[PDB]
Amino acid sequence: PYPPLLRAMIIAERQKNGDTSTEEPMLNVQRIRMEPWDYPAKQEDKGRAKGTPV
Amino acid sequence: KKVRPRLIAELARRVRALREQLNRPRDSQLYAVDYETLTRPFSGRRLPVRAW
Amino acid sequence: PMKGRFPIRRTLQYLSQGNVVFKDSVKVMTVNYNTHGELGEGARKFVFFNIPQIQYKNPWVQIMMFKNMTPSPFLRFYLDSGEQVLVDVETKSNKEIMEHIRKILGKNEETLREEEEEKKQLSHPANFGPRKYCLRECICEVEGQVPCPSLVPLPKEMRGKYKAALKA
Amino acid sequence: ETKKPTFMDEEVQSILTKMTGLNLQKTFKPAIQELKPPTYKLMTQAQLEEATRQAVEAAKVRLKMPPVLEERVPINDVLAEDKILEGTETTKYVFTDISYSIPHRERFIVVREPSGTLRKASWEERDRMIQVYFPKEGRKILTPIIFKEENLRTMYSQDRHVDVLNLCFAQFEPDSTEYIKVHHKTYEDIDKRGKYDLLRSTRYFGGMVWYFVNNKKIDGLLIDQIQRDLIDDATNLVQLYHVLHPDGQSAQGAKDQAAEGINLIKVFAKTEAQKGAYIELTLQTYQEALSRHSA
Amino acid sequence: RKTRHDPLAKSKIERVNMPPAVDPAEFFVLMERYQHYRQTVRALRMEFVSEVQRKVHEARAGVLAERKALKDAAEHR
Amino acid sequence: LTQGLFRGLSRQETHQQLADKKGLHVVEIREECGPLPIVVASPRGPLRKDPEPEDEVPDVKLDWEDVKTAQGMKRSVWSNLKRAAT
Amino acid sequence: VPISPYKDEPWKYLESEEYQERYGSRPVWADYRRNHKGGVPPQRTRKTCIRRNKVVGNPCPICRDHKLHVDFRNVKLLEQFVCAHTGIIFYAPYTGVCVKQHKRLTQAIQKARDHGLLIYHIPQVEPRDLDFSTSHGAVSATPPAPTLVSGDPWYPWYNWKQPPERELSRLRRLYQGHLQEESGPPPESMPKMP
Amino acid sequence: KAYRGGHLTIRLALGGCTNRPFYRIVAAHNKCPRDGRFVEQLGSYDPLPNSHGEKLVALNLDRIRHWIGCGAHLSKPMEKLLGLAGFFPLHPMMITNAERLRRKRAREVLLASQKTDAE
Ligand code: FES
Ligand SMILES: [Zn+2]
């Protein structure tokens, strides 16, 4: 679902424009592929420590 | 409106970049670890307590 | 008094009375007028009264004037596309020239209101800040909300001095 | 089928506009405010007629009767109930959409209560929040104390009824519960004390006639019109009354007798008017005086 | 705040910040709420991003924008 | 200042004279009374049927002190100072 | 000690013969002048004419007469400090009143206008809205969501869901020696202190 | 001014005098000062309750959706104000801190009951 207020504002545009429907506004969460936090990132775009020995 | 050239800022910039490419530390120096004090001798920084 | 003849021209009220706002096309305006002759009288009055009003409304438009180069006066505008608009202003009054160039190259009253309405959305009444930009600086100026401590001292229970002492 | 005219109909607006009248001396009365030196213009006989003609056009734009609306319905709509947030807060939040290009009656104003309920702000809360972020000159966040019964009577005692209506129009909305009660009290006092003239040549006269005709209290107003040689306005008021109440004794009687002009007042006076006897006596006197002038 | 060239304090040389204790249940439950919350907010972000493209493309190459440039150019001729 | 004040205050033209001189109505326009035209004086003689020729720009000598004040340029720490009732 | 008898009814002093014999038809401040250097006076008057029950040399119009009470009911005295042509309260240097009484007059004058005792110009403003329809969802009814009718949360994860035993075992193993007591499902509703 | 890296964020800019906090929602650069230069002001939040007992939160939803579609981030306090309004989902920590408070208050009711019961 959309969060409550946004859903209320999506149903008011419809009725303001004159469109009459009983369908629910819903977000397509199929595109978003949630990867784990421990997924290998790119080491070829990562930096390196500078040569400042201590 | 004619900026007075700053040549020493360009000479040094090239030299510093060059040295970073000829004196660069290796993986053996950067990623060495003392297993008794659990610090990186290169930088003297303790590792996190969850990795020990 | 104010030096010069017709000193009312050198006033902000008179310079803002022009209703000729050129479009984005108009880049250069050239005025060719004759100092003497009855036919050229209107152009002389157009350069004496109306030209200041046009340059004040169109400060990025170049306005150049040439004297006694041709037998008759005329106006010529140079658009940004490369088009030249000739306007023979002989045997015409200054009011006719000002009304003629406002119809072929000037904006109407509908296009001007839109521009002014776009500037009313830049100053939101809800926003808080300095008087220069916003109406109110803080929300302590709104009746009902907790007033500023400078005018009305807050209760001892709402101040961090006693809270710390009260806690310890 | 057969719809009863509303307050904004052309046929009704033209009647209430004529009853209101136009008085420039009273419409453009010298306001008490910061002053500037006046400007003088040398005008001819014809330039003065055109200048006075433009004042009649501006006074009819200043006398535009405000629309009469009905009491708005309370807003009781819950968007969400979140029981997990119960007890996590002591006070409630009021969120307002301060987007500029939005009408104030299409603006979303919600309230997250301490019980986790996300409801819509009520009318009293909406109007207050719109005056905090979109302040309007003349309106105050906190309801003034002049609209109390005791303070209003004080104003009524000074014949300042037009001031009470202007303050209410600048503080409350036409469809409020306080704008309809403050107006009716003013109208009711006018009928009691016969101060109809005060609202004449204003934008609040049409609304005063619409409340009496619908509540059948035009006896006082009709008498005042008769006492001011205003039969034209007196006859149009009965005609209006008939239209709104077709199935009435007077309306049926008129059609039967095809009464016109002064006749309508007589038919209405007997059949429906509460003060039937008084109207006839007042109407009688007027008719007698008119005959003398004709002679 | 300090810079890179400022020496470190001598009171922090021997400082070790121990991580907080973990509640297996709450931590697992809290890791899923973030998982879903961020998936619900990423979809909304895309929606808001999709409205900014339209408006931008509905002003320079829109049907109501190309219908007025011809009206303004036709009146000029 | 005394001999000059009485000279200028006695050589001032009233609204009635202005009407008689020009045979036209002198109308007073006030912001408080809005656009309503108030007739302050009317000519006793024949009212002229032709209006005064309107002038696009008037060749009247102006005062820089007044123009400088209307354009918000007259800075003075002594003007419009709070004083007693006079 | 001055004990004015018109303390409760201050409006009776202006309609008496002692006021007419002292002030007459003019205002109380008509015959008051400030003492200062130069022709240009200071932009502010003295804070107060009474300091610790002691009056100064030249008291102001309100402080020189103890029978003049600045109340919101004494409309006849408050009209002397408001212009009858512009409806503006005069500044202190005009009348000569002190900051304390001029600050008390303004408060009394704004309270007489809020009670309908003092007449002031009330303009005829325009409507706030161009439309008056109340059919929009913002001020109307919104179709209740399924979750709201079923007494369920907007999102499922809002409610606590007990995790499986195998996963907690990973965490315990992951954080050995740095653990806290496992927490059971929270109570459905917030408790209250009896 | 140009910052190396950085991005835009919709945060809160603290304002008001001592013991009288007033926040004003703004879209500003990450590296800019809290109450420094801002691109736009998108609302205001008054923490202190008013006479009616309510906290005022102004939200310019129209402009908040524009800057979120241009690459602007959100701060935790600003992400919790939109969950209370219903524009965003309830922040996970708003739900977890509410559960911790329940257990806390349920743990204190036992002691109170025992005292009145045992004693
Ligand atoms: S200015 Fe708002 S609190 Fe001081
Ligand atoms: Zn004093």
Residue numbers in the entry:
A (entry chain 0): 165 to 218
B (entry chain 0): 4 to 55
C (entry chain T): 2 to 169
D (entry chain R): 64 to 358
E (entry chain U): 27 to 103
F (entry chain D): 345 to 430
G (entry chain O): 46 to 239
H (entry chain M): 10 to 128
Could you share sentences copied from the article?
Structural analysis of mitoribosomes from GTPBP8 knock-out cells shows the accumulation of mitoribosomal large subunit assembly intermediates that are incapable of forming functional monosomes.
Therefore, we performed FLAG-IP of C-terminally FLAG-tagged mS27 (mS27::FLAG) overexpressed in the GTPBP8KO1 cell line and subjected the enriched mt-SSU complexes for cryo-EM. Specifically, 37 % of the total amount of particles represent mt-SSU sub-assemblies, all of which lack the last MRP recruited to mt-SSU, mS37 (State 1 and State 2). Indeed, in both biological replicates of GTPBP8 knock-outs, mS37 is the most downregulated MRP of the mt-SSU, as assessed both via western blotting and mass spectrometry. Aligning with this finding, our cryo-EM data revealed the presence of the stable mt-SSU assembly intermediates lacking mS37, while the rest of the resolved mt-SSU complexes (~60 %) were fully matured and associated with translation initiation factors.
